[PDB]
Paper text:
D1 and D2 are tandem RecA-like domains with an α/β fold. The proteolytic products were present in the crystals and their proportion was clearly increased in comparison with the sample before crystallization. This result indicates that the missing C-terminal portion of the D3 domain might be owing to proteolytic cleavage that occurred during purification despite the presence of a high concentration of proteinase inhibitor (see Section 2). All conserved SF2 helicase motifs are located in the cleft formed between the D1 and D2 domains. We found that the residues involved in the recognition of NTP, hydrolysis intermediates, catalytic water and metal ion are invariant in ALSV NS3-Hel, which suggests that the catalytic mechanism underlying ATP hydrolysis is conserved in the NS3-Hels from segmented viruses. While most of the catalytic residues of ALSV NS3-Hel superimpose well with their equivalents in ZIKV NS3, the P-loop of ALSV NS3-Hel adopts a different conformation.
ALSV belongs to the distinct Jingmenvirus group within the Flaviviridae family with segmented RNA genomes. While segments 2 and 4 of the ALSV genome encode the VP1–VP3 proteins of unknown origin, segments 1 and 3 encode the NS2b–NS3 and NS5 proteins, which are related to Flavivirus nonstructural proteins, suggesting an evolutionary link between segmented and unsegmented viruses within the Flaviviridae family. Here, the enzymatic activity of the ALSV NS3-like helicase (NS3-Hel) was characterized and its crystal structure was determined to 2.9 Å resolution. ALSV NS3-Hel exhibits an ATPase activity that is comparable to those measured for Flavivirus NS3 helicases.
Residue numbers in the entry: 338 to 398, 406 to 472, 480 to 576, 582 to 735
């Protein structure tokens, strides 16, 4: 019926087996079904796992079942009716991702599916009434290093022979930076280090797929979020709202973050998971750090569209008062999708959604720095 139905699916489960059955059960009452997942690789995985299902079309930026990503579905539902329709059901995978677009998308699918006179449903599936699924296809062994991540990867390199291994590191730089640890692993273990960041994902990813015999060590930021073990810093590089703007800080990753970083190893093979002893899984934030700037941009959009908002910190509530985009400023952001920050979209799109002059664009961003200093306008 017109209902939203969560399904707690463990990370990398035999979802493939189950999603084609959900699409045909939704062809009961509705005429199209949209399938979306965070990154493109999941969208291709979903496309693969629907191979034998007749009228299936992809949307990677007539038909009856579209698969695409969270982002470019949002970009589409907003530009082409869709939400005014009553015969479109949705299936969303990895609803627990830390993107503002997933958040607003979830709200809009919820609105158009529980709508009055609706004849469509939604199926949400996540690895996170407070529950986090830590099951996998194969068993996973949880261990604890007390002495640092590099040295626990040395212990592993010698106690075990070469394996495929991966290290989840907060930032590209720092004393625990991807660059910094890869050099130290390079110079100790016989493993070859493949660094993966958004800054370098596209070039090195190719390198990741060869069979490395002396050993392979993926040192990765959260973009990566097939191998035999995972070493977790249990730390991330959020940007956070600080009441003068935003600042970049290292944080204990959220329960949902580590649940996905772990969920990389148990899918096709036994795997081991190494977290630091001094990490409070019980006590870290479940889904989002209380005042992360992703929770600001999501609520900013949700308020303009007069949708239900998300639990957030006090510094965000404060910031949602200094910064109040209009329905169309957040449409232009969500639909032309060439400004990473909603804050900067407010500089280039007027209150009515039209493009601003060059001198108007520059006046507004300087005025905005008087009260909100977004530190993402640099790096």
């Amino acid at each position: 019926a017109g209902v939203v139905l969560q399904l707690f699916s463990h990370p990398g489960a035999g979802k493939t087996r189950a999603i084609p059955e959900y699409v045909r059960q939704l062809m009961t009452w509705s005429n199209r079904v949209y399938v979306a997942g965070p990154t493109r690789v999941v969208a291709r995985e979903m496309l693969e796992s629907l191979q034998g299902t007749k009228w299936v079309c992809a949307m990677v930026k007539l038909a009856r079942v579209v698969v695409t990503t969270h982002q470019t579905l949002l970009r589409y539902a907003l530009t082409s009716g869709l939400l005014f329709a009553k015969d479109v059901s949705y299936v969303l995978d990895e609803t627990h991702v830390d993107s503002a677009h997933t958040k607003v998308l979830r709200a809009l699918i919820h609105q158009t599916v529980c709508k009055e006179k609706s004849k469509a449903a939604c199926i949400e599936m996540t690895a996170t009434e407070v529950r986090v699924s830590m099951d996998s296809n194969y068993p996973i062994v949880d261990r604890v290093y007390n002495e640092g991540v590099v040295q626990a990867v040395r212990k592993y390199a010698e106690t075990h022979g070469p394996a495929r291994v991966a290290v989840f590191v907060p930032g590209l730089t720092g004393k625990n930076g991807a660059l910094m640890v890869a050099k130290h692993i390079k110079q100790t273990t016989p493993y070859t280090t493949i660094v993966l960041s958004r800054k370098t994902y596209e070039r090195n990813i190719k390198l990741v797929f060869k069979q490395y015999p002396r050993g392979m060590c993926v040192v990765t930021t959260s973009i990566s979020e097939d191998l035999d073990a995972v070493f977790d810093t249990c730390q991330q590089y959020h940007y956070l709202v600080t009441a003068v703007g935003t600042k970049g800080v290292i944080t204990p990753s959220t329960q949902a973050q580590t649940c996905q970083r772990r969920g990389r190893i148990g899918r096709r093979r036994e795997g081991g998971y190494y977290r630091p002893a001094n990490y409070d899984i019980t006590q870290a934030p479940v889904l989002d750090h209380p005042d992360s700037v992703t929770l600001l941009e999501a609520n900013m959009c949700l308020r303009a569209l007069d949708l239900p908002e998300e639990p957030c910190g006090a510094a965000v509530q404060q910031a949602m008062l200094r910064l109040q985009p209009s329905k169309d400023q957040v449409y232009r952001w969500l639909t032309e999708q060439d400004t990473e920050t909603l804050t900067e979209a407010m500089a280039i799109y007027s209150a009515e959604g039209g493009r601003r002059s060059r001198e108007q664009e520059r006046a507004i961003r300087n005025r905005m720095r008087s009260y909100f200093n977004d530190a993402r306008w640099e790096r």
